[PDB]
Amino acid sequence: KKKSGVIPXVXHDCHMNXFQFVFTCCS
């Protein structure tokens, strides 16, 4: 949906760690 997902590691595809929300949108 965005065009800047790789540094923070948001959503669910760039990583599995998580960030901010760290719930639902992460995994």
Side-chain angles (χ1 to χ4, degrees), residues 5-17:
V6 57
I7 272 147
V10 307
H12 181 194
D13 233 318
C14 66
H15 249 303
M16 55 192 207
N17 292 27

Side-chain angles (χ1 to χ4, degrees), residues 12-23 25-26:
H12 181 194
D13 233 318
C14 66
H15 249 303
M16 55 192 207
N17 292 27
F19 184 33
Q20 292 294 273
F21 42 87
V22 294
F23 230 106
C25 173
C26 192

